[PDB]
Amino acid sequence: TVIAIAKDGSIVEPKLDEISFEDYRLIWIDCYDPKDEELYKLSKKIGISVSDLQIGLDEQEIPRVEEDEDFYLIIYKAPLFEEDITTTSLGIYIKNNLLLTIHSDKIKAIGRLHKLISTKKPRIVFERGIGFLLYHILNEITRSYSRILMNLEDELEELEDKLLAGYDREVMEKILGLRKTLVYFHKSLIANRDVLVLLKRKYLPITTKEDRENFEDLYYDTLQLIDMSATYREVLTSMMDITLSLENIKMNQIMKILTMVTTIFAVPMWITGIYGMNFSYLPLANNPQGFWLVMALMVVIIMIFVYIFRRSGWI
Amino acid sequence: VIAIAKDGSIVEPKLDEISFEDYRLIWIDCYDPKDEELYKLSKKIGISVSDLQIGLDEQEIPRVEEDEDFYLIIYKAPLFEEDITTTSLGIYIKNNLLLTIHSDKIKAIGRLHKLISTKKPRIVFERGIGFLLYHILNEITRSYSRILMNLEDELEELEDKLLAGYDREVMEKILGLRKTLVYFHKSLIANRDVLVLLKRKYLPITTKEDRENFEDLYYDTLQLIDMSATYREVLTSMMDITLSLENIKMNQIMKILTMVTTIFAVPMWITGIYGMNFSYLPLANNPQGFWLVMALMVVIIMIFVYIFRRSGWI
Amino acid sequence: MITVIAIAKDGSIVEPKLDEISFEDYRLIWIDCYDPKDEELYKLSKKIGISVSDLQIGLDEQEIPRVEEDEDFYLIIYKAPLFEEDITTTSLGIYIKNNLLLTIHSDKIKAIGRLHKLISTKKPRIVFERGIGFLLYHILNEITRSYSRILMNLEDELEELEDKLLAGYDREVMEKILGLRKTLVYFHKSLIANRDVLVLLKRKYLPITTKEDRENFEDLYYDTLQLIDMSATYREVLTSMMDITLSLENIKMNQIMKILTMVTTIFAVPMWITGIYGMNFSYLPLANNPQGFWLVMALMVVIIMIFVYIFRRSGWI
Amino acid sequence: VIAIAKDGSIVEPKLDEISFEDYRLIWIDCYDPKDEELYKLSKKIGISVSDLQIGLDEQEIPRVEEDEDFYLIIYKAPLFEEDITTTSLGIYIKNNLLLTIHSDKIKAIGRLHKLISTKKPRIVFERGIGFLLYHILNEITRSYSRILMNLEDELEELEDKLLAGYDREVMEKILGLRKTLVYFHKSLIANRDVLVLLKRKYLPITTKEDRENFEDLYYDTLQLIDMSATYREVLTSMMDITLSLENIKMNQIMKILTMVTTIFAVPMWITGIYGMNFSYLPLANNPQGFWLVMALMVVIIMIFVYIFRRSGWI
Amino acid sequence: VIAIAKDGSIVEPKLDEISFEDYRLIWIDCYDPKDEELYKLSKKIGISVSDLQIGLDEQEIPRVEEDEDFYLIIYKAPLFEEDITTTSLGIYIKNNLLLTIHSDKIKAIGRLHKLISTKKPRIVFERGIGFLLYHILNEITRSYSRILMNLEDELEELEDKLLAGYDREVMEKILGLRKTLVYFHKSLIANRDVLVLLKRKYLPITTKEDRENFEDLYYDTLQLIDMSATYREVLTSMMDITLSLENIKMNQIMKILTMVTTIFAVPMWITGIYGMNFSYLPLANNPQGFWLVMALMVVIIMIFVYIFRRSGWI
Ligand SMILES: CCCCCCCCCCCO[C@@H]1O[C@H](CO)[C@@H](O[C@H]2O[C@H](CO)[C@@H](O)[C@H](O)[C@H]2O)[C@H](O)[C@H]1O
Ligand SMILES: CCCCCCCCCCCO[C@@H]1O[C@H](CO)[C@@H](O[C@H]2O[C@H](CO)[C@@H](O)[C@H](O)[C@H]2O)[C@H](O)[C@H]1O
Ligand SMILES: CCCCCCCCCCCO[C@@H]1O[C@H](CO)[C@@H](O[C@H]2O[C@H](CO)[C@@H](O)[C@H](O)[C@H]2O)[C@H](O)[C@H]1O
Ligand SMILES: CCCCCCCCCCCO[C@@H]1O[C@H](CO)[C@@H](O[C@H]2O[C@H](CO)[C@@H](O)[C@H](O)[C@H]2O)[C@H](O)[C@H]1O
Ligand SMILES: CCCCCCCCCCCO[C@@H]1O[C@H](CO)[C@@H](O[C@H]2O[C@H](CO)[C@@H](O)[C@H](O)[C@H]2O)[C@H](O)[C@H]1O
Ligand SMILES: [Mg+2]
Ligand SMILES: [Mg+2]
Ligand SMILES: [Mg+2]
Ligand SMILES: [Mg+2]
Ligand SMILES: [Mg+2]
Ligand SMILES: [Mg+2]
Ligand SMILES: [Mg+2]
Ligand SMILES: [Mg+2]
Ligand SMILES: [Mg+2]
Ligand SMILES: [Mg+2]
Ligand SMILES: [Mg+2]
Ligand SMILES: [Mg+2]
Ligand SMILES: [Mg+2]
Ligand SMILES: [Mg+2]
Ligand SMILES: [Mg+2]
Ligand SMILES: [Mg+2]
Ligand SMILES: [Mg+2]
Ligand SMILES: [Mg+2]
Ligand SMILES: [Mg+2]
Ligand SMILES: [Mg+2]
Ligand SMILES: [Mg+2]
Ligand SMILES: [Mg+2]
Ligand SMILES: [Mg+2]
Ligand SMILES: [Mg+2]
Ligand SMILES: [Mg+2]
Ligand SMILES: [Mg+2]
Ligand SMILES: [Mg+2]
Ligand SMILES: [Mg+2]
Ligand SMILES: [Mg+2]
Ligand SMILES: [Mg+2]
Ligand SMILES: [Mg+2]
Ligand SMILES: [Mg+2]
């Protein structure tokens, strides 16, 4: 009874719908945004409470591993894209030979796994058993984080040449937005890291020594993802610090103007000030040359200061 | 301010202090006791009222002591109380006896109480005193965990308030979140090394399984330290970004000043020369004059305001 | 320099090059394929028996470093530095199945060039007794060397930007610094992934490596580590440089503000004076005085000299 | 300025020069021993004078050294001497001889002495020269631990004068704590690595219970290092907020200057035009002309004063 | 200068040339040989003149070189020479020989040649050549740790010129220190990884004990890298501070401008209204008029000086 519920198992590589846990050497059941009909049917089939199952579907829930008698619950976060809304998701229940991924959102890695089983359905063999299937699901989810990270890098790219042109509100709002997403993703990477730490550290009925080691690889990958995310955080911050350090420079050229105007008419306005004084005997007031004389001395002053300001270089 | 009890030789019975025992293992909770009751405790257990007074020192540091005839474990738990959050407790263990005495209220502990009790009855316990120790510690860990989720939510909430520019309240809120966070880190660190102990050192009070459990709890505490640290980084981030987004303002201001000042500069000089006291002022007696110069100035102005509208000021 | 699509390697006595057409009579072969057209790829895939798509993975230059089982071959993606007009970059990938080690890359790999040309000196001589894992080692090491060289040169250019930095903030040079920075963040991502590949190669028991091989891949790991650390330090130094120029730009606002403030204080009072003495009342004290103008003019200069003194002394001018 | 001895069979006496054989272990303590005290000492114990002279060098950096016939363990201890906190001491052990020799007063050592002098308790050492080493180091490590609380207090006092605006005192206080903590870094990280040597390698001087001890002491020292670092971080952010806050006030200042300047601009122009002469100054001769123009000016000032109140700004 | 031979049989006989048998291990430190002398040595010891030119390149990088009938170790050692420091020093060890050659002064190998020749050094080696490698590398490491303190004295000096704001000499100096510190860092990293080789892999030239001694060395060298980074950031902090102080003084300036601009604004508007050409100026023809207005302006002024006095700008 599809929801979508996709099913995989055994010797050859058959798909299938609800029935017969045996023979079936291993069975991957995937359940997507199921309506309570599906939810309850699936539950009644696999011997897991509809509420237990619902833990998987609560989508803000934190990545972790848990033992419950007769099944293991792993919660891992997976990236979604949705027009600069980029955030996380899913749960996994393994009991006996059953690995169940049940997710309220779309998991692209699950999709990809499905397409990599889509090559010659009767092909692509597995001797490795459940822990390894868990490994792949997890690995793919990781790869996604990788691709997203590349996207961020492209984003950085764009903003990069808009950098040394000083402040722009649009630019910096884009920068800060990047910072935020970056931190969401970081917190999720952390959470996931630690799931992997457990899986690779503990002995568990579900995983072999080969599995366990595989998860360790997966852990070094995941740590790289962390290291980059943190790196690009520092980068962005720096970008902001540069823009602000440019603004603070225009804060310079500007006062250079203001001081140039103020300083270039100072002596002249003193002049006018004195030659507007109500004294009798303003030397040269009754001089017929006086007005033009003064006009001259002023203009010469101004010219001087404009030279002195020319070099040393200001104007 | 009351003691509590659990678990005799079949299943878990309850309560009375001063009862004949023979019990499997017995949990006794104690809260801000009064010197009388405290003494009563001292007698019933066999530890000194002096050794029991340590666990009561609220700033006392997390650690493990090995002394004869009891084990001491000091551990820091979160403390909520209305916008002001902090840290507390201590534990004593001998034989079948586990003793939690705090001078503040440990919500986790209370949770474990309600959880175990769930009247009546439930939750069979086969694993021993190391395991009770565990659950006490696991619930106390999970408290920090949920409070941290709170600080995360409360942290996002200062996001779009911040965008408004420097705000003294917004600030002090941040600064406080930081205070709480540094605090949380210190304690968290300590508790971590304690766990490093119960997972490492082989003891009489812990089994292999117990040890594994303490190890899980170790990795979890580590995770809380990681989280806490991140949050502090993000706080400092907000702080710096607003604080610094002030300087742009301090810029456009100088834009205004420099524009006013430069726009009327010439018109002022003009008006200055034409205020001069010479017998001859060109145009002075010309009845169109005042309007000719008036226009000179008006056009000078317009020209400057034009130089500024474009390229680019305003 | 020059570069060919396909190349080829050693067999039961020593190493010749080859026909495109040979198979089971050679000890181990190294095929190096560069930027194949789909048709050419189809020829290759046809001969070596690795699938088209499987190979095109190798051909995607954005592909991340890793090691893949995929029974009937091992795959290793490893990051190499790119020059391609002074924008330093990263790429490549590698398949080993049977005695065949295929390096295939969409980009140009300097290291593969180096190895290729070095094999010109097999006369005087050289001898390879060590089998595939060791070849792998040699390619991976050669790439590593490439990074190291890029790094040395960079350390050399830093000290050049170092003095330009002291002439005052320059948008060009800031550009260069920012660019080296970007390059080092690229190197970080890449060197990091590369390293963790090395860690697997030296750790996991693999049919294609042997305790000796792994032994090599270890010192390779450590080497990679040292690259990482050195590069981080180059970045830290770059960031230093930027931060210091800009921080030393933002001071000038001081001499500036001091100038504007100093003109403005030096004539403030004398202006007031000339202002009150321009108010036209009936009686203006000293105004009917023949010497009055010189009196006031003098008061004003003195006020000036004073403020100039309070300025010149006590810092400023 | 002194030497201090210890520990016969069954219990610990205090000994004049000299007695050796029977005693299980012996702890000599030389504080700033004078040249004659060092010759007496050196010949007395059997370790070279110039070799005792290194323990007297306070600059000497922590380590574990194996010489022929004895061991040198140099350690860092917090020293005080008037609100400038710092680091010091060395150690030599051969056979049953532990020797703590120091130029600077070492509080933790003084502490061991003044504690041992009680002797009401058992109080018996079964654990040997190794355990003695542990106890001494462990005490030093405690000293650090306590000074860290000192800092928690002082910091939580500075958090208050933080937003109060840049103060030079607040400044050099912060920068003083800073220096100190950098000190605790160098030292503490070196001390840490000694505990790592002592905890790992098999030494004739240390039993296994001994080593285990030194390990827990490793971890404790890791917390000291970590916390010290965090505190540095905090002081740093404090310098950052005050400084970056004092920065922001140039905004309110340029607001004032700009506002004033802009508020009388148009008016000073008016008075400028109306002071030009210029016969036929429009309105010059209307008796109500004056109040006319002055009305105009006042209104204008009002309209800017308003414009500011309205937008931002005031 | 040039060759120094060592350890003939049992005790330490600073030696003569030729011979080279009936020993355990021989150590020869060449100093800045002139081509003829490095020639003599070269043809004596049987290391190709070029193989030695190796150890003579002060700019060459450290590494652990397996040759046949030879082992090369390059290592970076500090130098003082008037506040300008650098790197150095190849080391060539074949069979039982260990050669240490350098173009610059090695105060470490000097401390070694000086510690071995005091009477009898004396001690002993049952430990083989490896342990001498260790003592050498080690000694050098101690040398570094010792310069670290010099930088410490320079920082100590700077700290009180810090709060006075910018000084060109101070600044350029901090910077200089900083970059020196960076050169140091790069070297320390080099050496380190060399030590990771000796500590890491079995070489027939090192025992397990040796290997482990090299590990201790590694850890110490890590503390050096850690000190290096720590103090670099300290320097950066120093700069950033003094700059922030500057950016604060700017405010006292701007406040001064604003206080002057505001002291006379109203009074200049007043002088502006009374300099108008209106035929009626209220109060002009009044003979107390002048001093009326004047006292008005004056009172305005004082009013503003006070209005600045508190809240105080003045
Ligand atoms: C796992 C460690 C690292 C992974 C996570 C890194 C965080 C950044 C996300 C990656 C790339 O960035 C993501 O890409 C999409 C488009 O593909 C962007 O979409 C859009 O976002 C905003 C909103 O309109 C626009 O400013 C932007 O120009 C546009 O491209 C978006 O800004 C961002 O959400
Ligand atoms: C454009 C519409 C209406 C215009 C009105 C009529 C004409 C314009 C105003 C007249 C100005 O009159 C002006 O005064 C004096 C002459 O007395 C001249 O002065 C000039 O000659 C003397 C030499 O003796 C010089 O010292 C002086 O620097 C120079 O400017 C000037 O060239 C003239 O231009
Ligand atoms: C920016 C201000 C420029 C104002 C100065 C203009 C130049 C004046 C020259 C005109 C004719 O010559 C001028 O005659 C008078 C005589 O009373 C001189 O005055 C001189 O002597 C008398 C002595 O009682 C003084 O009051 C005065 O300070 C002095 O300058 C003046 O120095 C000289 O220069
Ligand atoms: C503030 C900056 C610019 C202003 C400066 C120039 C002043 C002139 C402009 C005033 C408007 O226009 C001009 O002024 C006055 C109006 O009061 C008119 O003159 C009138 O003034 C008043 C009326 O209020 C009457 O007493 C008087 O009999 C009448 O002639 C004049 O006919 C007109 O042409
Ligand atoms: C510094 C700012 C301005 C200074 C003001 C000082 C006040 C002086 C007090 C003495 C009274 O002075 C008197 O006041 C009034 C003001 O309404 C003036 O104006 C009054 O008379 C005129 C002329 O007939 C009328 O047009 C006008 O409606 C009336 O108000 C008057 O010309 C002046 O003679
Ligand atoms: Mg259940
Ligand atoms: Mg189970
Ligand atoms: Mg089961
Ligand atoms: Mg099961
Ligand atoms: Mg199961
Ligand atoms: Mg795949
Ligand atoms: Mg594996
Ligand atoms: Mg006038
Ligand atoms: Mg102005
Ligand atoms: Mg002005
Ligand atoms: Mg493939
Ligand atoms: Mg891999
Ligand atoms: Mg693998
Ligand atoms: Mg397979
Ligand atoms: Mg390098
Ligand atoms: Mg970049
Ligand atoms: Mg890349
Ligand atoms: Mg070998
Ligand atoms: Mg080797
Ligand atoms: Mg600055
Ligand atoms: Mg020994
Ligand atoms: Mg001994
Ligand atoms: Mg300092
Ligand atoms: Mg030779
Ligand atoms: Mg040789
Ligand atoms: Mg060589
Ligand atoms: Mg040879
Ligand atoms: Mg020895
Ligand atoms: Mg010092
Ligand atoms: Mg010096
Ligand atoms: Mg060590
Ligand atoms: Mg007049």
Side-chain angles (χ1 to χ4, degrees), chain A residues 143 146-147 149-150 153 157 160-161 163-165 213-214 216-217 220-221 224 227-228 231-232 235 238 241-242 244-246 248-249 251-252 255-256 258-259 262-263 266-267 269-270 273-283 305 309 314, chain C residues 62-64 66 169 171 174-175 178 181-182 185-186 188-189 192-193 195-196 200 203-204 235 242 246 249-250 252-253 255-257 259-260 263-264 267 270-271 274 277-280 284 286-290 292-294 296-297 300-301 304:
Chain A
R143 312 289 307 300
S146 278
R147 316 192 194 269
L149 200 236
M150 262 140 188
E153 289 161 69
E157 183 104 323
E160 273 162 0
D161 69 83
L163 192 91
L164 281 184
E213 288 179 334
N214 269 137
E216 172 147 75
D217 291 333
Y220 295 137
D221 281 338
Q224 282 173 27
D227 190 18
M228 275 320 123
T231 270
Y232 291 144
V235 173
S238 139
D241 286 352
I242 296 149
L244 304 191
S245 235
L246 303 189
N248 281 153
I249 287 163
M251 178 184 89
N252 279 51
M255 306 296 283
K256 303 174 72 186
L258 175 46
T259 300
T262 299
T263 283
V267 233
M269 305 300 282
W270 198 38
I274 100 145
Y275 271 112
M277 290 196 279
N278 289 344
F279 287 96
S280 337
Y281 199 1
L282 269 287
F305 276 27
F309 271 160
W314 244 270
Chain C
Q62 270 307 302
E63 192 57 274
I64 21 190
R66 67 153 162 300
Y169 168 83
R171 198 169 191 279
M174 208 60 49
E175 288 281 27
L178 273 149
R181 244 239 230 115
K182 179 181 189 184
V185 191
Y186 267 70
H188 192 81
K189 212 212 187 186
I192 256 48
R195 173 203 66 204
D196 295 349
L200 187 137
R203 172 170 55 90
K204 277 189 49 188
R235 288 206 304 286
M242 306 214 323
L246 306 180
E249 216 53 28
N250 257 111
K252 290 151 179 166
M253 257 298 276
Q255 204 195 204
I256 276 127
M257 296 238 258
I259 288 290
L260 152 164
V263 127
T264 276
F267 336 96
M271 297 299 284
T274 75
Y277 260 80
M279 296 182 299
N280 31 236
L284 235 24
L286 247 92
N288 303 263
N289 211 307
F293 167 85
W294 296 119
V296 171
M297 209 54 189
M300 299 193 304
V301 274
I304 300 191

Side-chain angles (χ1 to χ4, degrees), chain A residues 179 193 201 233 251 261 275, chain B residues 219 226 233 251 262 277:
Chain A
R179 265 257 229 76
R193 175 189 67 212
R201 158 201 33 166
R233 287 235 297 273
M251 178 184 89
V261 165
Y275 271 112
Chain B
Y219 283 117
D226 270 336
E233 274 145 35
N251 247 26
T262 258
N277 285 8

Side-chain angles (χ1 to χ4, degrees), chain A residues 62-63 167 172 176 179-180 183-184 186-187 190-191 193-194 197 201-202 233 240 244 247-248 250-251 254-255 257-258 261-262 265 268-269 271-272 275-278 282-288 290-292 294-295 298-299 302, chain B residues 149 152 156 159 162-163 212 215-216 219-220 222-223 226-227 230-231 233-234 237-238 240-241 244-245 247-248 250-251 254-255 257-258 261-262 264-266 268-282 308 313:
Chain A
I62 17 79
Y167 187 109
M172 171 147 316
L176 276 85
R179 265 257 229 76
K180 184 138 81 73
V183 193
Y184 263 71
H186 199 88
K187 88 149 288 174
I190 296 294
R193 175 189 67 212
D194 290 89
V197 168
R201 158 201 33 166
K202 283 174 47 196
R233 287 235 297 273
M240 299 191 331
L244 304 191
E247 277 357 67
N248 281 153
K250 312 154 170 189
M251 178 184 89
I254 263 179
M255 306 296 283
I257 276 60
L258 175 46
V261 165
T262 299
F265 307 48
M269 305 300 282
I271 294 316
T272 87
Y275 271 112
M277 290 196 279
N278 289 344
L282 269 287
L284 350 159
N286 321 296
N287 194 307
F291 168 97
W292 286 104
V294 174
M295 278 307 280
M298 276 185 294
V299 172
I302 315 212
Chain B
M149 314 196 288
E152 179 203 322
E156 233 243 292
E159 207 72 270
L162 141 159
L163 232 200
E212 237 61 289
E215 209 218 15
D216 300 338
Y219 283 117
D220 295 332
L222 284 179
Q223 238 230 61
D226 270 336
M227 280 317 173
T230 256
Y231 295 148
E233 274 145 35
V234 181
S237 159
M238 322 190 67
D240 288 335
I241 303 159
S244 292
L245 278 184
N247 305 15
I248 308 328
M250 174 178 60
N251 247 26
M254 286 169 315
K255 267 195 172 177
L257 189 70
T258 301
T261 327
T262 258
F264 309 75
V266 248
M268 291 298 308
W269 194 48
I270 288 336
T271 71
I273 122 172
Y274 278 105
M276 296 195 282
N277 285 8
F278 300 90
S279 300
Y280 187 44
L281 271 290
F308 285 160
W313 280 214

Side-chain angles (χ1 to χ4, degrees), chain E residues 77-139:
Chain E
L79 209 41
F80 310 86
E81 303 195 289
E82 218 258 75
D83 302 314
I84 268 293
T85 129
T86 327
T87 56
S88 307
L89 198 132
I91 286 172
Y92 307 80
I93 95 184
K94 91 172 190 176
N95 292 304
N96 92 255
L97 195 270
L98 161 30
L99 170 287
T100 65
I101 169 166
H102 43 115
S103 299
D104 276 321
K105 299 206 165 185
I106 297 308
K107 289 317 174 178
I109 307 196
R111 300 170 195 186
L112 230 36
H113 279 334
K114 186 178 184 65
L115 192 40
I116 283 200
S117 182
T118 61
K119 228 297 185 178
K120 232 66 268 183
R122 45 155 54 80
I123 204 161
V124 265
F125 300 115
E126 291 282 327
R127 294 281 294 98
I129 190 168
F131 203 101
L132 175 51
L133 183 49
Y134 161 96
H135 271 257
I136 303 161
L137 252 32
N138 171 340
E139 249 303 318

Side-chain angles (χ1 to χ4, degrees), chain D residues 10-39:
Chain D
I10 316 309
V11 55
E12 6 64 328
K14 307 169 196 304
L15 297 308
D16 64 349
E17 325 153 342
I18 321 83
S19 55
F20 234 77
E21 182 60 50
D22 153 56
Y23 290 166
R24 291 232 13 264
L25 11 147
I26 317 177
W27 175 18
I28 292 184
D29 179 38
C30 255
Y31 167 78
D32 200 350
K34 54 176 41 48
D35 320 279
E36 315 180 47
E37 266 279 296
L38 209 59
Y39 190 47

